[PDB]
Amino acid sequence: MNNLHRELAPISEAAWKQIDDEARDTFSLRAAGRRVVDVPEPAGPTLGSVSLGHLETGSQTDGVQTSVYRVQPLVQVRVPFTVSRADIDDVERGAVDLTWDPVDDAVAKLVDTEDTAILHGWEEAGITGLSEASVHQPVQMPAELEQIDDAVSGACNVLRLADVEGPYDLVLPQQLYTQVSETTDHGVPVVDHLTQLLSGGEVLWAPAARCALVVSRRGGDSCLFLGRDVSIGYLSHDAQTVTLYLEESFTFRVHQPDAAVALV
Amino acid sequence: MNNLHRELAPISEAAWKQIDDEARDTFSLRAAGRRVVDVPEPAGPTLGSVSLGHLETGSQTDGVQTSVYRVQPLVQVRVPFTVSRADIDDVERGAVDLTWDPVDDAVAKLVDTEDTAILHGWEEAGITGLSEASVHQPVQMPAELEQIDDAVSGACNVLRLADVEGPYDLVLPQQLYTQVSETTDHGVPVVDHLTQLLSGGEVLWAPAARCALVVSRRGGDSCLFLGRDVSIGYLSHDAQTVTLYLEESFTFRVHQPDAAVALV
Amino acid sequence: MNNLHRELAPISEAAWKQIDDEARDTFSLRAAGRRVVDVPEPAGPTLGSVSLGHLETGSQTDGVQTSVYRVQPLVQVRVPFTVSRADIDDVERGAVDLTWDPVDDAVAKLVDTEDTAILHGWEEAGITGLSEASVHQPVQMPAELEQIDDAVSGACNVLRLADVEGPYDLVLPQQLYTQVSETTDHGVPVVDHLTQLLSGGEVLWAPAARCALVVSRRGGDSCLFLGRDVSIGYLSHDAQTVTLYLEESFTFRVHQPDAAVALV
Incomplete structure (x- = not known):
């Protein structure tokens, strides 16, 4: 007992x-x-x-x-x-x-x-x-969700300039994750481009999270x-x-x- | 005998x-x-x-x-x-x-x-x-069949939020299966995107079925x-x-x- | 547990x-x-x-x-x-x-x-x-309990004619069992004759039972x-x-x- x-x-x-x-x-x-x-x-x-x-x-x-x-x-x-x-x-x-x-x-x-x-x-x-213990200014996300690769690249560049390196994981809220998954651009899903930009990382479905964030x-x-x-x-x-x-x-x-x- | x-x-x-x-x-x-x-x-x-x-x-x-x-x-x-x-x-x-x-x-x-x-x-x-023993509300399917990935993602998100997980199989009627197969979007078949969204699952050709449905x-x-x-x-x-x-x-x-x- | x-x-x-x-x-x-x-x-x-x-x-x-x-x-x-x-x-x-x-x-x-x-x-x-799932008509029991062998023989004959065979057991209520046991006829207990008529069977004392019955x-x-x-x-x-x-x-x-x- x-x-x-x-x-x-x-x-x-x-x-x-x-x-x-x-x-x-x-x-x-x-x-x-x-x-x-x-x-x-x-x-x-x-x-x-x-x-x-x-x-x-x-x-x-x-x-x-x-x-x-x-x-x-x-x-x-x-x-x-x-x-x-x-x-x-x-x-x-x-x-x-x-x-x-x-x-x-x-x-x-x-x-x-x-x-x-x-x-x-x-x-x-x-x-x-x-999120709170972050010295980097938040990266603005473009609208229509096709240009989320721009924000992803900006975050990756900020982390690279901060000498952080390592594969990056992109944690997203559940709704934003579904919207990104259903976004198809010119018939090419943006998830593949995000995975390429994340340097071997992955996009994480986090229903509990209420903010999107990239972590090395x-x-x-x-x-x-x-x-x-x-x-x-x-x-x-x-x-x-x-x-x-x-x-x-x-x-x-x-x-x-x-x-x-x-x-x- | x-x-x-x-x-x-x-x-x-x-x-x-x-x-x-x-x-x-x-x-x-x-x-x-x-x-x-x-x-x-x-x-x-x-x-x-x-x-x-x-x-x-x-x-x-x-x-x-x-x-x-x-x-x-x-x-x-x-x-x-x-x-x-x-x-x-x-x-x-x-x-x-x-x-x-x-x-x-x-x-x-x-x-x-x-x-x-x-x-x-x-x-x-x-x-x-x-279909009858389902607690989830039916997911509406968008028209023109290029946006069927939206309904697929919605069903996958509903199942994920219901803590169901596992690869999902999308059973379709025969006519809808042929229409989805012949739909090409921007020269990229939607079947590949559906397979990606199904988390390792597959699209099933069911001529006997008269309703489309996703099963874990x-x-x-x-x-x-x-x-x-x-x-x-x-x-x-x-x-x-x-x-x-x-x-x-x-x-x-x-x-x-x-x-x-x-x-x- | x-x-x-x-x-x-x-x-x-x-x-x-x-x-x-x-x-x-x-x-x-x-x-x-x-x-x-x-x-x-x-x-x-x-x-x-x-x-x-x-x-x-x-x-x-x-x-x-x-x-x-x-x-x-x-x-x-x-x-x-x-x-x-x-x-x-x-x-x-x-x-x-x-x-x-x-x-x-x-x-x-x-x-x-x-x-x-x-x-x-x-x-x-x-x-x-x-008792309920029985196709045989109930056998009437004579009074004074000395002639219960007549009813026993009638039940045995009915079962034999129905091609049932096998030793028969006579289940009795507790009060009737005691009365049969205390019945002595001409100084010869009727239980011995009942056992002989039951073809190697036995008389069963069933206080819970409220009806007498013979089962093969x-x-x-x-x-x-x-x-x-x-x-x-x-x-x-x-x-x-x-x-x-x-x-x-x-x-x-x-x-x-x-x-x-x-x-x-």
Whole structure:
């Protein structure tokens, strides 16, 4: 028994397997900010901060000089959701037509908050995202979406002049991604030209993101520090429904602010 | 001797081989609904129902509570056709110019009914097809057929937002398939762009289908349960003609209604 | 953890053993309908129907003829009962004078409903019992109970003329069984003569049965299909009492209606 009291939940092993599979597949599908940043191996619930490597202003009394280290604490996110004991029982009887809508909604909320923190910043967790921690002026996007290659080339040139290099990934909102995909120019999709301009990179479909942005993928520019990873725990239950939650402890840090540029 | 009294039919072995080859080739060519759904190994004529895994409302008398399981019975389809003893005799004499038109017509009818049940639903067999068992609103198709990529992208985005994923297959009626194939845009066929948008999927020529629709191919979203497969049996004969039939027992079930979207 | 959340119940292992032993012994003692019918190995909770092997009337549209298979769904029975935490705790302390009256009552109710379904029919589960699915006219029983051998011989002759054969078992209600046992004729118990007339069969004490009936034991005349067998599950608990239940999923089918005759 860890802090996730899964053994106390009135849920069968098959139902647990189905719920975990649904949650992990939805998270893998929906999470797009984890592909543009470096995600090391999770440490554990014990870890609580990441040291920035800097020190504050040092006070001087007598011969003694004292300076304080600078750290960024982690934050944990818990999203609770309620599932149906009827579906849990149907799992063992053989139901395969069960749609875990509360689980999908909880995973969607978790991905939304994590991607917002990664790409823009939270300001509640002390996290500054790629867009906010950017020294480059935003690149204007031309209209009609056929000339988006101009903005892509401008962003690539800005990153190249900033000595950033590496293949660039273009993260787009879901609506803009669909519009770019359906744009065909002179019968030649603009996605191919964008991929050519991205120097071996790719265009990323990020429904959670509300801003388009280009990030270099050379490595070491940003990092998502994870303690406890995405896990499902048990809270309480009734005669009809069972309350579970998704828990994840993390923080995000941008080392080089010049490796990302926001197109707007 | 099974229920198919083939040994009683006045048909030579070579004629049986020719008829079976014609029937199986026509079925493989004409059946398009079997490629978008999961078809497990046939069980046999003994199987008669598939359990849905759910139970009905439970009546409560005294301490006894009784609840009834929910099942879907299978249905068998028999299509009879009449062949010519003159052609049957010519088979052994060496005729290779024999067109088994009644066999082709029977296979066409069987494919029509099976594909209609799979893709739209029968309502006589208790079968709900992919189109009817769909929670997504139908996607409007633009005119002139050059902008069909817009509808394809919209369907793909709807499925992606529904966390469905997997390569998508676009089933089209035969006339619409020919029109899409002959559409060339700026000298660049739209089929290539459709294949790119389908995420490794394919466009399927379905003459039996009367509605266009996109289905995910990840697996486990729909299933065609088969008892007896497509087989040819003997009914009666005259001095001139022999009456045979095509028999197939099946049912169809959609587990996840959100894996398919109908373009109309 | 299966659907029986036994691990969540605040019940010790010794108390579980005592409750299970009491339930199984009471069921073995009290269930008499299971001895006259064929009981195969239980399949499991996944099974939900039994195919009758027949098909309904076939509709004919164009060349297509469609016919629907006939099946009988299973039904599950749940009987809840409340036990005492004081007795549960006394079990480990060493109490051996504990009478599990709620468990006995629940087992009695389960046996009553199962035996009624087997021998007479439920009409709620779609089950037709041996008495109802009988083509033989009921055999009149003479008074004073010394001449019950006449009715037994008449039933045996009816079954023999129906080409049924096999040793016959005479199921009686509990009161009639006691009266027959205490009847002594000319100082010679009628039970011996009944056993001689039953052709190697036996007289069965069935308190749940409310009608006397003779059933052949040759095999293959009736069948009790079982999914989940008799098992004990956990529902809820309080500071004083624990609520459990007995669950059993089954159906019953008579293949040959002429192997049983009801004496009334």
